Every structure is written in C-alpha cells, then in structure tokens.
C-alpha cells in the first residue's frame, strides 16, 4: 500500500536522530562498559522506542540509548516459499556478524534481522555510511529474495528433464 | 635447544678476546698455538655442521660458541664458492683466495651479529682479531677441500651442495653486501 | 627518614614484579618485571645494532625479550633459581634504578605467609652475607596491607602473580590458623588464556610470548558480574570482540575469552585445581572464625595485589558473598538480607605494599630492625 | 533400530566410512574433492559460483585424485573444516553415493578433532539435522575411541582403561591422558608437527637437492619416500657421519613414472630418511615457534595429571594414527622418557640421603595393528551398543533448542 | 576558522596552558599528550602515562600550572611539573564507579570530579599527608554527573546530571575559604546546599556554564534545547526549542550571548534578551573552551570532537 | 550452588463545519501526557488518527504550517503512535503527514520524541 520512497525517507530521518551516541562507563558495575540497549540495567539511559511501518507486515523498530542504538526490521514474506528463503538468507548473513560489525548474532523475537550500533562504531566508522547500509538493505532484500525464487524454479526444471529424458 | 654447542672450553685454555681464542691446528701462522689432540674447533664446526644448520635457534652457552657460529658461517661461504669449482685442485687455490679476504671482523660494521660481539677495544686485540680470524679461515678452507670433493671425479659432491641453500639461522657472512 | 640521615627501602620481591621505593613515599619509584635472561639467536628475527649484555635483567630484559631466553628466578613465592635471584637484586641496588648502592641504608622484606622456612632463611642469609646490610626486617605480607589501608581489623585477600592468600587480622591480632592459600594467581590465568587463544588459532609458545599474553590479559580481560549475562551477550551480540596488535603487527581478535579466562578465580575446576573459588574460600574462612569476630570481617574485606585489578572483581566478589550469606546463614530468608552490612575495601590504589606505615611509623631510629646481627 | 548406524570419520588426510558393527572401515579414501574448472569464466564478476545444476559435476575420493579436468580441493586443514561449501558437497556424495545411506533413517556418529571451535560444531550439526534431517547425531572425541580400539583388541588381563594416547595423524598431533575412563581435559596438549609438515619438509629437502622431479609429482614422491624408506634414527649427528662414510649403501634409489610423458625418472634418496621422523623430536626444524621434543611434551602431560594416576599412565602409552607407524618411533620415545623419569627420581634420592630408593617407573609405548583406523574401529564398537542410541541427540532436540545442542565439549 | 587533526580517533577532552602555548589532549587511550606550538605544526613534548584506563577529563590550572586528569580508572591525579618531568599525586577519591568530569575552581585551591557514583567529589590538599582529600555532594544527585562549571565565587558549582535536571550546589569547603560572599542565587549556603534545579523533566544535560557575571547559567540538553536561567530575575528559566540535532557543549561568550556545538558538528550561536527573556538562534562537537577573553568577552574559542582534531574560530 | 540465587537487584462539530483545520487545532487540546492513565492514551490516539485521515492533499501542507512549534512536536508524537498498529492502508496517510511535519519540525522534533519521558 504505502509506496517505497516516502517510507524509506521517514526511516532515514528517524535513524539519523537516534544515532547520537556517546561513550558511557556503566553505573552498576565497577568499570564495565557495555551497550545499554542490551543490558538494560539502567532505565533512565533509555530512549523511547519508536516504530515506523509501511503496512501491517513491513516495519522498523528504532530503539536507542545514550551509548547504543538497536534497529530491527521485518520484510514482506509474500508467499510460503519466500519464508524459507528469507530465514536462511538471514542465517548465512548473520553467521558473519563478526564482519558485519553492526549485526546481532540473533534477531529479536518477531523481527527478521536486527543491528546493534554502539558508540565505538559511530566513532570508528562513518555514520552516514552505516545508515546508507541499513537503507540499502531494505532497498534490495526483496529483490535478492525474488532472484533466488527464479533460480529455484530453474533448478527443478532442469532436474525434471534430466530424469524424464532418459525414458 | 639441543643444537650442538662448543665442547672444547676447558678452563685451562687461554681465553683472549670476546670469543674463545683456540689452538687452531694448522701449518698457517697466527696468534693461536698448535693443538695436538685429534679434535679441534675447526673440526668441531665441520663435524656438527650438517646438524647445526637445521636448528633455527641457538644460544651462546659459553665464549667458545661465539667462535663456532663464525666458523660455521665461513664454512657456508666455502660451499658458496667450491660448488662452482671445476676440480679439487681449483677447490684448494680458489679457497686460499677466499681466506685472505677482508672479512668484517665482529666489531666492524656490516658484520651480521654486532649485537652479540663486543667491539675489540685496542690494537693488541684488533690486530689479534685480524691475525686470528684469518688463521681460522686459512685452515678452515683447506679442510673442506679434502672432503667436499668426493674422489671419483672431482665433482663438488652433491650431498654437500644441497646445503648451499641453507644458512645458519639465516645469517650471512656477506653481511649487508659483499 | 633516619636521624642519622640513612634512607630506608622496601622491596616487595614480587614473584612477577619487583617494586621499589623509599620509606614514606606514597608511590613506588620503580616497577619492573623480575625477568633475567641470556641472548639467543633466532631465525625469525633480524639481529639489531642494539647491544645485548651477556645477562640482561629487569626492565631491559622485558623490552629486548625478543632476543632473550628469559627466566623468572621466583616461582610461587619460592626462589627456584638462586643465582638469577642474586643478579636481580644486584641490579636493583646497583647504579641503575634504585641506586642506594650501599650497605648503610635499611631494607624491608615482605614474605608470604605459610612460606617454606628455608626460603625465608636464605634471604636473611644473603642480605647479611652478600650486601652486608646495616638494617633488615621481614614483615608479614598480610599486615602491610592493613598498615597502608589504615586499619586494624579485616580480612586481607592478596592475589599476586604467584599465589593467592587470605589472611584475617582482628584488632591487630594475627589469627594464623585462619590462613588459607588458593593456588590460582596471575600466572595461571595467563597460561589458561594461552590455551583459550589456541582454540582461536593463535599460537604462542616462546618465553618471550608469555609477556605478550600478559599484556593482552591486563588490557582486555575482565571478570563477569553475572556470568549468565556475559554468556548471553557473547551469544547474542558481537560487541565483546575486540582487536589487539601483537609485536609483529598481526591484528589478532579476542572475544569471550576476555571474561572466560579471569573467571577461573571463581571456578578453579576450569583449571585443573580442585577446590573452591576465591569468594567461597573467603567465606569458609570467616565462617571458621570465632563467632563474634565474623561480624567485623564482613565489613572489612580488603583487596591487595595486581590480580585483583580486573574490572568488576569487587562487584562480582560482593555478589557471591551476599548470595553465600543468604543461602547458608539466613537460610533463604531473602528479605532479611537488607540487614547484612557487608563492605569491600577496593581502593583504586592497589599495589598495596606501600611502605609508610611499615617504616616511618615503625622506626625513625629504633632497636626493632634486626641489624648486622 | 534394525538398520545399523553410520560411522563417518573425517580427517585432514583421509576419511573413513562404513556402517557400525563392521570390524573394519568399508571405505578409506583421501579427503579430497575435485570441483569443475573454467577458463577464467569465474573472475572478479563472480568466483567459483555455479548456476542451474552445474554444481553437481564433481567427484570425491580416489575418483577425484586422478581426473585431469578438475581442480582438486582439500577442505579440511589442521583437522578443522575450512570451507563448508565444499564439505557439504563432500558429505552429500558420501551419503547418497558411497554409503548408500538414507540420512533420514540412520543414526550418525561423527568425529571431533579435540582442537575445533564450537562454531564448527554448530555448523556440522546444522548440516546433519537441517540439511539432511538425520534422526540423531553424536560427536565423538577421537582419542577416546582410539583407546577403546586398543582396549577391545588387547588381552583382558591388561584392559586397563587407563593410558595416554598419542594421535599423530595428519594435521595436528594430540597427546591426551585418560584415567579409568575419564578424559583429564585440563592436561590435553597439541603439537603442530604432523604428517603434512613431515611431507612438506621432505618435499622442500628434495626440491633443493634433487631437481628433475616434475612439479606435478613432487608431492607424490615425497609421500612415497616418507612411507617406504623413512625411519627414526638413534643419534642425529652419528647418522650424518655414517651417511658420509657409507654413502655407497645408506643412500637409496626411488624410480618414479612421469604422469605426462610416461618416461621413468630416478632420484637418489638420502638424508631424507632420518630427517622427517626426527621433526617430532626437533620441531623447530619445521616450525619457527615450537621446540619441545615430543618425548618432553608427553612428560609434561603426565606430570600435570593427579598424583595417583601418574605411574599407571607411564605403564600404558598407546600410539594412534598413521604417522606413529615410523620405524623405531616407539623405541626412541620410550628411551627418552625412561632417561628422563629415572633421572628425576635420582634427585629425590639425594634430597633424602639415599635413605630410601623409590620403586622406579617403568614406561611402555605400545604399537598395535589398528593404528591406521583405530578411530573408526573405536567408533564402530561404540555405535554398535544400545547405549549409544541414547547418548545421541534426537532430532526433536535440534528443533526445541537451536543448533546450540552441540556447543558443549568435554575440554 | 582553522583546523588540525592530532589523531584519527576521538579526542575525548582537552585543556590549555595559561598562555595557550600548549594543549593537553587524550588520544582515546589511558594517557594524556601535551603539544607545543612549534611553528604552525604541533610538536609533542611530554607524555603522562600513569593512568590505568581511558581518561575522560582534564583541566590545566592556569596560574598554578598543574594538571588534573580523571577517567574510568576511577583514579584522579594532580600533576606537578617537578623539573623536566610531570609527577603525579594521589587523590583519595572514595568513588566506587567511573569518574566522568573534572574542573578546577577559579582560585585553583580546589577542584571537583564528577562520577557515575551519583556524587560530586570536591577536593583539597592535605599538607601533612601528601595527597588530596575529598568531600562529597551527594544528597539530590540521582544519576551520573556529566558536566561541571564553577561560579566566579569558587564556591557555587553547577552540575549537569544525567537526571534531566541541572543543579547548583555550594561547594563551600570551610577549611579553604572564608564564608562566601552573598550572591543572588541565595544567601544561605552551607556545604551541599541546593541552590537551583531545572523545571523540565526530559533529556539528559550534557553541558552547563556560568556567565562571567554569575547571575546567568545556561545548559544544553539532549532534547535539542538550550536553556538559560537568570538570577536577576527570580531564577526564571527560558528555553529555546530548536530543529538541530542534540548539542553537547556550551559556553558563554558575552554577558548576553552564548555559543554551543554538537552532533551537527558545527558551532551555533544564541542571544539572550534581557527584557522578555527570549533566546534567539543565530546559527552557522564535544567541547568548547574560550581561548582569549574568558566568558566576559570571547574573541576566540576552540572545539575538539570525536571526529578528531581541533578547530579555532573568530 | 550459591551463585544461582541472584542478589543485587467537539472535534466532529469542527470537522463537519468544513474548515476542518479548526478541528485539528482543537484535537491538540486533549493530551494525557502528565497523567498515569493508560486507557485514556488509547482514546487520545483514536480521536486524532480519525482526523489525520480526513485531509485532502490540497490542505495537508497548511495543516502543518498553521501549527506552532509545540504543535509540530505534539503532532509527531501522534504520528509515531499510529505506526505501532496501522490501519489497512492508513500508513499511506501517516507517512504523508510525516513528510510535511518533518519538513516543518526538522529532526529536532524527532529527538524530543525519542527523549520524551511522558507521552501521548
Ligand atoms: N590492570 C591489571 N589488570 C589485570 N591484571 C594485572 C593488572 N596489572 C597487573 N596485573 C597482573 O598482576 C600480576 C602482578 O601483580 P603483582 O601484585 O605485582 O604480583 P607480585 O607482587 O606477587 O609480583 C601479573 O599477572 C600482572 O599481569
Ligand atoms: N608407512 C607409513 N609410515 C609413516 N607414516 C605413514 C605411513 N603410511 C601412512 N602414513 C601417514 O598416515 C597418514 C594417513 O592418515 P591418518 O593420519 O591416519 O588420518 P588423518 O587424516 O585423520 O590424520 C598419511 O597421511 C601419512 O601421513
Ligand atoms: Mg606480590
Ligand atoms: Mg586424523
């Protein structure tokens, strides 16, 4: 229902306001330094979580803190075959969360993938290029899904001829 | 660890310099006297050579090791030349031509182990170093000529030439350059 | 200082670090590792122009370790190479570093408790048979903490490089039978960290490498506050992964090993040692004490020694004691625990063998120092 | 169940396949896969990525060692699986072609090299449960199986259940102590010296001396001389003196066949024979940064074990994996240990004035015919038991938890 | 303006020598480095190594010429130039959590360290034991303290809490001062008296500053507001809502105009109307300090950011 | 053992009056922000999203521009409420208000939504 260009622009601006991190040594352990969004041990360091949504299926949650922000996405599963392709796409990507440095090794329940951005990343990597990555991820993922669907048809169509032809 | 360290450092032996001055058995001339027993520091470096070059680490256990590591490097330099020799007779004279070359003395720059050898402080050590280190080389060459050239054809023997590529802890007596 | 103008020095003789200063100084002047070593040729290294002595010692032997086969003369508090031990002191008092260079000035020694008696006595020999010192004393390593902290009652937890000790002191009385040792100290945590990085495919094996994983340990490691929370944050998210640069410039990466290694202090069974973790060995010590003294030990836990520096260790330690007291004293009467006043002295200054109380408050001039006899 | 379980042991040199209960592995094959190749059609636009059904044109095992038109790949290195794409293609063809097993109806026992990271135990479990729908998997410690192979083979009067096993396969050597059926996990040591690096050392040592070896076949001949002529010697420098003086006869000849021209070629075989096996005793010959002789690594293990089990461990050292087959390899390790142990007791004699003489430790190093497959044969005798079927993870457990059911390991 | 980059990584805090000819900056590590104006370029001259963790605050006492530094190490040290070497000095900070901020008072006899311990520690020197000893302002603090600024009287201390509120406390140490002169923020001031507290309830306060006439404070808040509060009026606050990103640092530049910087990475400017109390925005990362002229009439200022380096302005 | 047991813890009359901009100006009169109430917060949104969906695109520009700065900040909090459970197509309209509202309020009007400690 909602078109792509207005929806993406809204997510960009919100995420630009949330990416305002600073370093913060924790209050509740002697000198540990940890992302407040994950440990949630303090509860005045947390920002109000906000959702942007294109329709009832596609939405983004932006959830910030003085030193960290978490972004979690859900994508339109347009048919049964696409659920399986999508889930496995995430797993093989998420399996390299040590190279996608902003990526959590697990999604949030009810979300398909989720990024944890700490102050160290926004100090060590160009902020506007991380946001461009998150936007680019949404610009492509349903093209990248559909391309596998076209190829999975082709594989089966070859396998059928390879069996039937030898009769 | 268990590399072959120098055996001969009996404390009754004189110990001139930063290295064991030792009684090099030769008909050449120098500051060191003549050993009479059948075993000697040049024979020791020759004997242990094929083993020593594989050990990638080597301590200085005593002063005689700072001799032995230098004899080993010169032995390698012998092979770097004898391998080219067309016959044993050339392998002798073209070895003497190497012995009387101006090798960097350990305190001189361009020697590879300047961290490990102290400077010779005065002429009566420095000139002793010139007259000792040549007496090492002059003898060391004449001993390899007899046993690198296997007697059937004065080929430089293959087994020895294998070691031409291998250098004792990858240090070279060519220094930073010849 | 002395009315004779003599100076007085403290040596911690530490199993890993010798630590030296003059009496009354709030700081040591020199901290340096106890390494002693000989030059060794190595294929993997270019031999420099830097001169290597036939025996490097101390700080120099640490920076030039890449050329050196290095020993520790001290192991687990017992001298195991007495010749390198002499050479380490001969370096300490020589022209280099703490240049007293003399017999006339006094030295304090610190010995661990429950120390094999011959170890103590050989030190007292060489101090008078070799340096011919004018004044020497051997102090109970545990009491020096409370002198520096300015206390008289409390239980001293003293995790050095070699061995961990717990020693109660009550209003200045030594209670010896409540001494305990735990054989987990900074050295074992280092070797255990080597093994943890070996699983991640980094090989460290030279003696020169041991100092490198120590420098890793000191900068990246920490003790988990709620070990379940650390494990979930490792499993769920990447933030624990952090880089380090080895001497050759390999940009190695280390992860949950940052907390899995220090945890061995609370779980000796992760290493081969069978026993109880520091918190529970501390709790059993207090519980063995005579019943009225326990009320004060809970309020005056005192921390000493570099292996207590790990981020969060005071917080982790306090949690295990509160939970132990809930489980075994209040018998799960949870809400009562608001009454359990417990406090840990964890002052950020914690090379806690400073000398002020032990020297100047003990003698400006006195018959206490042992003397040539 | 009625159908037997599969036992699939994968090493970095070889893999070993068969159903449980057999006495002996039904396939021994090299751990190699030969994928299809192209004239730079794979490039910066896309590397080794296939389309349609082009990915299924490949082979594994000896069917892949000698095919001309394919690029040979070796997925397992230092025992660890390095490229799971090739390993999964390898596993499929093992199951659906070599074993003929239907994965949905046979339990699998599959082997862990004691070094491997937990992530690799997740990924290997993800294969069998989520790719193949195996009904249940178990991941076995290779060393404990090797001990069980000795245990069932050796005489019932000495079935000690206690010993140190040395498992020098290819990849990495493990030294592992087991006391009365429990792995002492704290004491396990890894030595990087293994059959590959002994091969590589011999390969370099030849290629410097003996050029004439064709580049396609350097590796084959290096393996041959390692297997056929190499031995652990009595004293390193004393061999060099014997090889100089009796060079007429300690030197040997190997004749190879040129794979392309079918001309023969010959090489003189010499110092290669005793260098190599002595890399276990002088690891710095092959690695910059390991130096303890194997005869002194094994001592440190026992000396870290609990005081009661120490002597029994010396009484029963078991040799496992192919590289331990070298001539005299047992004799020398026993001599070095014996010379170390009784000298250690000589100290404690003097610290007690000779007032009491300790009962000297006897040391035994034991060679047995299973050595080429003791890991699989142990695996088969385990997976036969009705107990085994309950130690395995049932597939539902992979559904309720994640793949994390294989995070745990006994180290 | 001009720009220079000292390092790739964040310059977490800076301080200046009295005559500005040197700066101290922390290279995102457990040290502080001092640079000298050797030409246009900067030369590193000294290196203070003693901390055991990342430092997060510096102030370089102008006349006393001594540097205070604190950080997550919890330790703070005051550094004396004992000849050609800076030597540290112990401070018995009783804090149990990470230190976060430090500033010297104008009389240079005391300083204060903020921390995550939910306290401010005021410090003064014991002569008899060579260390600096602390007293804590502790009562209405309830979250970490992010920024400190000292009133011209060296007694009143404004403090930005991560508690959505800006507070002013009398840090009157009787061991160091006569009872302080009367002030519009209130004549009643023992140690730890609560002089003022912001009306709002949202957004962390990153920065606070006192005008050179102490009657106006302004503070800068993560809800993208700058506020100024006036003691010539009855402590009346006025707030400007703005369309910028959050601002991290603020300082006065005249008695009635103000300057700030933040996550937009550029300076911005405000004026304060004495009549209506209305602020206004004039426009144009992590610190601002006036280089010449103080808060009475600024003529240059410096800014250092996480993006690296410092800038100097007009 | 021990370490297991954790310790340490009116609008319709303006709409149908045609100048429906006057309704939205009235809809901002009912903020529940300060209250502890929760059922009222569910009422507050429904009274506004019914208004937001009524506008023609010829007006949604001025309907923002006629607000004060508080009005825009007030509006953005209602916008981020409808996204939490869209109607069958109403996201198509909220994203169109968002375009206008963010043009007037800038990203600063978002930040004091993220930091808003009490909300409608
Ligand atoms: N900041 C630190 N964090 C963790 N470990 C440290 C730190 N500083 C020192 N250590 C460790 O503490 C040990 C040395 O402590 P020390 O008190 O000097 O022992 P000893 O006095 O017995 O030699 C070493 O293992 C060293 O690595
Ligand atoms: N006669 C032999 N002497 C010494 N080593 C051998 C001999 N035959 C085979 N080998 C070694 O045994 C290895 C066989 O594989 P193995 O090590 O048993 O399994 P894995 O691949 O699991 O390590 C060969 O790679 C080779 O290195
Ligand atoms: Mg100590
Ligand atoms: Mg194997």
Swiss-Prot record, chain B:
UniProt keywords, alphabetically: Acetylation, Actin-binding, Cell projection, Cytoplasm, Cytoskeleton, Isopeptide bond, Nucleus, Phosphoprotein, Ubl conjugation
Transmembrane segments in this chain: where? none
- Report the record's Gene Ontology biological process terms: Arp2/3 complex-mediated actin nucleation; regulation of actin filament polymerization
Protein name in UniProt: Actin-related protein 2/3 complex subunit 3
The gene is ARPC3
What's an example of a GO molecular-function annotation for this chain? actin binding
Subcellular compartments: Cytoplasm, Cytoskeleton; Cell projection; Nucleus
Q: What is its main location?
A: cytoplasm
Q: How does it assemble?
A: Component of the Arp2/3 complex composed of ACTR2/ARP2, ACTR3/ARP3, ARPC1B/p41-ARC, ARPC2/p34-ARC, ARPC3/p21-ARC, ARPC4/p20-ARC and ARPC5/p16-ARC.
- One GO term describing the cellular component: cell projection
Keyword Lipoprotein found: no
Which residues, renumbered to this chain, carry the PTM Phosphotyrosine? 47
Protein family membership: Belongs to the ARPC3 family.
Q: Where is this cross-link: Glycyl lysine isopeptide (Lys-Gly) (interchain with G-Cter in SUMO2)?
A: 14
Modified sites of kind N6-acetyllysine: 56, 61
Function in brief: Component of the Arp2/3 complex, a multiprotein complex that mediates actin polymerization upon stimulation by nucleation-promoting factor (NPF). The Arp2/3 complex mediates the formation of branched actin networks in the cytoplasm, providing the force for cell motility. In addition to its role in the cytoplasmic cytoskeleton, the Arp2/3 complex also promotes actin polymerization in the nucleus, thereby regulating gene transcription and repair of damaged DNA.
Curated annotation (Swiss-Prot), chain D:
| Record InterPro entries | Actin (IPR004000), Actin/actin-like_CS (IPR020902), ATPase_NBD (IPR043129)
Query: In which domain of life is the source organism classified?
Result: Eukaryota
Show the Pfam families listed in the entry.
Answer: Actin
Q: Name one GO cellular component term.
A: nucleus
SMART domains of this UniProt entry?
Answer: ACTIN (SM00268)
Compartments, as annotated in UniProt: Cytoplasm, Cytoskeleton; Cell projection; Nucleus
Sequence positions bearing N6-acetyllysine: 238, 242, 249, 252
The record's annotation in PROSITE patterns points to: ACTINS_ACT_LIKE
**What's a GO biological-process term for it?**
Arp2/3 complex-mediated actin nucleation
- What's an example of a GO molecular-function annotation for this chain? ATP binding
Q: Which cysteines bridge via disulfide bonds?
A: none
Name where it mostly resides. cytoplasm
Q: Sorted alphabetically, which keywords does the UniProt record give?
A: Acetylation, Actin-binding, ATP-binding, Cell projection, Cilium biogenesis/degradation, Cytoplasm, Cytoskeleton, Nucleotide-binding, Nucleus
Oligomer and partners: Component of the Arp2/3 complex composed of ACTR2/ARP2, ACTR3/ARP3, ARPC1B/p41-ARC, ARPC2/p34-ARC, ARPC3/p21-ARC, ARPC4/p20-ARC and ARPC5/p16-ARC. Interacts with WHDC1. Interacts weakly with MEFV. Interacts with AVIL.
Instruction: Report the protein's function.
Output: ATP-binding component of the Arp2/3 complex, a multiprotein complex that mediates actin polymerization upon stimulation by nucleation-promoting factor (NPF). The Arp2/3 complex mediates the formation of branched actin networks in the cytoplasm, providing the force for cell motility. Seems to contact the pointed end of the daughter actin filament. In podocytes, required for the formation of lamellipodia downstream of AVIL and PLCE1 regulation.
Q: Which family does it belong to?
A: Belongs to the actin family. ARP3 subfamily.
Question: What's the name of the protein?
Answer: Actin-related protein 3
User: What species is given as this protein's source?
Assistant: Bos taurus
UniProtKB/Swiss-Prot annotation, chain E:
State one Pfam family annotation: WD40
UniProt cross-references to InterPro entries, sorted A to Z:
ARPC1, WD40/YVTN_repeat-like_dom_sf, WD40_repeat_dom_sf, WD40_rpt
List the molecular function annotations (GO) for this entry.
Answer: actin filament binding
Q: What does this protein do?
A: Component of the Arp2/3 complex, a multiprotein complex that mediates actin polymerization upon stimulation by nucleation-promoting factor (NPF). The Arp2/3 complex mediates the formation of branched actin networks in the cytoplasm, providing the force for cell motility. In addition to its role in the cytoplasmic cytoskeleton, the Arp2/3 complex also promotes actin polymerization in the nucleus, thereby regulating gene transcription and repair of damaged DNA.
Q: What interactions and quaternary structure are annotated?
A: Component of the Arp2/3 complex composed of ACTR2/ARP2, ACTR3/ARP3, ARPC1B/p41-ARC, ARPC2/p34-ARC, ARPC3/p21-ARC, ARPC4/p20-ARC and ARPC5/p16-ARC.
Give me the Gene Ontology terms describing cellular component. Arp2/3 protein complex; cytosol; nucleus
UniProt key word Ligase:
no
Q: Which Gene3D superfamilies match?
A: YVTN repeat-like/Quinoprotein amine dehydrogenase
Q: What is the similarity comment for this entry?
A: Belongs to the WD repeat ARPC1 family.
> Which SUPFAM superfamilies does the record match to this protein?
WD40 repeat-like (SSF50978)
Name any Gene Ontology BP term: Arp2/3 complex-mediated actin nucleation
**PROSITE patterns this protein is in?**
WD_REPEATS_2, WD_REPEATS_REGION
Q: Where in the cell is it found?
A: Cytoplasm, Cytoskeleton; Nucleus
Q: State the UniProt keywords alphabetically.
A: Actin-binding, Cytoplasm, Cytoskeleton, Nucleus, Repeat, WD repeat
Statement: the UniProt record of this protein carries the keyword Ion transport:
no
Name this protein carries in UniProt:
Actin-related protein 2/3 complex subunit 1B
**SMART domains, from UniProt?**
WD40
Per-repeat ranges for WD: 6-45, 50-89, 94-135, 140-179, 242-280, 285-314
UniProtKB/Swiss-Prot annotation, chain F:
Output the InterPro entries linked to this UniProt entry: ARPC5, ARPC5_sf
Superkingdom of the organism of origin: Eukaryota
Report the locations given in the UniProt record: Cytoplasm, Cytoskeleton; Cell projection; Nucleus
Identify the Pfam families for this entry: P16-Arc (PF04699)
A GO cellular component term found in this entry reads: cytosol
One GO-annotated biological process of the protein: regulation of actin filament polymerization
Chief subcellular site?
Answer: cytoplasm
Keywords linked to the UniProt accession: Acetylation, Actin-binding, Cell projection, Cytoplasm, Cytoskeleton, Nucleus, Ubl conjugation
- Residue ranges the record marks as coiled coil: none
| This protein's record includes keyword Ubl conjugation | yes
Q: How is it modified after translation?
A: Polyubiquitinated by RNF128 with 'Lys-63'-linked chains, leading to proteasomal degradation.
Single GO MF descriptor:
actin filament binding
The answer to keyword Cytoplasm applying to this record is yes
Q: What does this protein do?
A: Component of the Arp2/3 complex, a multiprotein complex that mediates actin polymerization upon stimulation by nucleation-promoting factor (NPF). The Arp2/3 complex mediates the formation of branched actin networks in the cytoplasm, providing the force for cell motility. In addition to its role in the cytoplasmic cytoskeleton, the Arp2/3 complex also promotes actin polymerization in the nucleus, thereby regulating gene transcription and repair of damaged DNA.
UniProt lists the family membership as follows: Belongs to the ARPC5 family.
PANTHER family recorded: ARP2/3 COMPLEX 16 KD SUBUNIT P16-ARC
Please give the subunit comment from the record: Component of the Arp2/3 complex composed of ACTR2/ARP2, ACTR3/ARP3, ARPC1B/p41-ARC, ARPC2/p34-ARC, ARPC3/p21-ARC, ARPC4/p20-ARC and ARPC5/p16-ARC.
What protein name does the entry list? Actin-related protein 2/3 complex subunit 5
Traced from the root, the source organism's taxonomic lineage reads: Eukaryota, Metazoa, Chordata, Craniata, Vertebrata
